């Protein structure tokens, strides 16, 4: 079951929200 | 990393702010 894939889609939205104009990186090394 | 830290237990926005640029 694609638990990690689904979690990451939520993580990027939450990062978008808190980071604001700072932005963020979301890589293989994040 | 972030999946390890934040997909195994809940990360608040305060914890996620660590990952901002
Ligand atoms: Cl989900
Ligand atoms: Zn979902």
UniProtKB/Swiss-Prot annotation, chain B:
<protein>
    <recommendedName>
        <fullName>Insulin A chain</fullName>
    </recommendedName>
</protein>
<feature type="disulfide bond">
    <location>
        <begin position="6"/>
        <end position="11"/>
    </location>
</feature>
